[PDB]
Each structure stands twice: as structure tokens, then as C-alpha cells.
């Protein structure tokens, strides 16, 4: 999971 | 937003549309190329080809359940691009070139007709 | 193989199937959740949750048009985790976190109870 | 487009  | 993102999210669903498709899961149609049949479904069709969206959004072929193509179409060229669709990875060979990009052309995929332009282009 | 692949295809692919979602082009099921209904595309649903999954391979509930989840299932849990399978992108917030793991766990979600669990964990 |  990431911050796009 | 403030969403976050599972970056391989899009792959897994690929992947598993083409699992569905391996499996004749679903699938909604076939595609007649020449001698040669392909199931698959109009949705992910759609999604990857300017024909295909083109044809499965007329009011009258969106409920067709075969779909015959030209001709001219090669069944191995449709065959790498169907392929290339559910997977993201295009065989591209010196042997089959031509008839992937003339395919690519026809089904209106402008990534593929693209890297095939390239190629060429560095083998003359 | 020697393949060559298209890094993007798989994101491309996903965003043309949410617009397809957004104008209702060959959707073939509603999720009926408590008052709210969902209009979805099979394939999609199974390629991202095992309980979707298990219900469009089983011979009879594969043909259904109307699918009604548990009671118990939030509607605004089950639209961010639909918009989560066409997107990639999870709006998971403290007033909806525990209603997205409940769905997620429901819907057999693993990556999304996975996140679920760790942001819940970090805020005792 | 890459090796993958
Ligand atoms: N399904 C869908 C779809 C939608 Cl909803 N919106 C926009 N394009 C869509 N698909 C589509 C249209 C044109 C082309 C491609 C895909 C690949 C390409 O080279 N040309
Ligand atoms: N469609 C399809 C499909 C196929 Cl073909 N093979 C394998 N899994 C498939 N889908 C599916 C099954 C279990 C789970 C998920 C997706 C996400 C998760 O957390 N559990
Ligand atoms: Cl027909
Ligand atoms: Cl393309
Ligand atoms: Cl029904
Ligand atoms: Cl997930």
C-alpha cells in the first residue's frame, strides 16, 4: 500500500 | 482525495481475467478469425482495442455473441494480441511482425502499433 | 518467453473497465445492499473477491442478475470497497474503518483486512 | 515498454  | 493504493491491485485483476479466460469463465463471446475461433470477454475487449469498444458500444452488436473479423486478419497476430491484452505481454518475434502490427492496426491498439513502428525501424 | 511488456497496460486496462462502470456499458449484475443497489460487471467482482468468486463459478448463481449480501453488510463499506476494485484506491477513513474491514472480511478481501488491521492497530 |  502506498500514498498516490 | 485521501484514498491509499495497493499498487499491484491492477495486475492481480489482469491476471485473474485471464485465469477466467483459460477456464471459459464467463466469457461472452467469440471471435471468428478466419478458420479460427477465440472466447473471450467483451468487457476486457473493449477496455484494450478501439474496435472492439467501438463495436460492443452500438446498440445492436453489443448483443451479438460472434463477432467475425476481416479477412485479411491473421489468426496468430490475433491470437499474440489477445494474449496481450489479458497479460500485458506481447510476443513479439521478427517472423510475426507484420502481422502483429497490421492486427494492432486493425483492432486500433496505438501502444502496440507504436513498439512495432520501433522495431522496424531499427532493423532497417 | 521473450516477451516485451507494457508497464501501464494493466492501470489502463482497470480505468477503462471503471468508465464502462460510470456509463453502465454491458454491466450484468446488481449487488443489493440492504436499501442500496450496485451495478457491477461479474468478471471484475470475481477477479477481486473470493465471496464474488465462489458465487459467479457456482453453476446455478452464476445466471443471476440480483445478488443480496448479509443484512448485517454496510452499504457505504460495500461502495468504497466497489470503487476500491475498479480504482486500486481505498478511501479508508476513522468513520468508515470499521465497516470497510467488516465488508472486506465478508468479501474475502485480504489485502484490504490487511491494511484494515494495521491502521487499527497503530491508533491503540 | 520493457523486459519483464
Ligand atoms: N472500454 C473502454 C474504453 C472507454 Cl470506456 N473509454 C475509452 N477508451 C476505451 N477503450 C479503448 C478505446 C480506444 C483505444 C483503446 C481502448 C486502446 C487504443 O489504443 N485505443
Ligand atoms: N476471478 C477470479 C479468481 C481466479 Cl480465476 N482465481 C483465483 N482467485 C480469483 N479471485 C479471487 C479469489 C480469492 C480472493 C480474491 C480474488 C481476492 C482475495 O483476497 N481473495
Ligand atoms: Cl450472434
Ligand atoms: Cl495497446
Ligand atoms: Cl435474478
Ligand atoms: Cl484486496
Redesign the interface.
Known amino acids: ?4 | ?7 499491484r ?6 491476471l ?2 485471464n485465469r ?1 479466460r483459460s477456464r471459459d ?2 466469457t461472452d463471446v467469440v471471435i471468428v478469425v478466419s478458420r479460427e475461433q477465440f472466447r473471450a ?4 475487449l ?3 482495442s478501439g474496435l472492439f ?1 467501438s463495436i ?2 452500438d446498440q445492436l452488436k ?1 448483443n451479438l455473441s460472434v463477432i467475425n473479423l476481416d479477412p485479411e486478419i491473421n489468426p496468430e497476430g490475433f491470437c499474440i494480441l489477445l494474449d ?2 489479458y497479460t ?6 521478427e517472423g510475426n511482425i507484420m502481422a502483429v502490427m497490421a492486427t494492432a492496426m486493425y483492432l486500433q491498439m496505438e ?2 502499433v507504436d ?1 512495432c513502428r520501433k522495431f522496424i525501424k531499427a532493423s532497417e
Not at chain 1, 500500500?1 to 498516490?4: A, G, K
Not at chain 2, 482525495?1 to 499498487?7: G, K, L, R, V
Not at chain 2, 491491485?9 to 489482469?14: E, I, K
Request: some cysteine; charged content about 10%.
Open positions: 500500500w502506498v500514498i498516490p | 482525495d485521501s484514498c491509499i493504493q495497493f499498487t491491485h491492477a495486475s492481480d485483476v489482469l485473474n481475467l477466467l469463465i464467463l470477454h467483451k468487457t476486457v473493449m477496455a484494450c469498444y460492443f458500444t453489443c496481450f491484452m500485458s505481454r506481447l510476443n513479439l518475434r501502444h502496440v513498439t
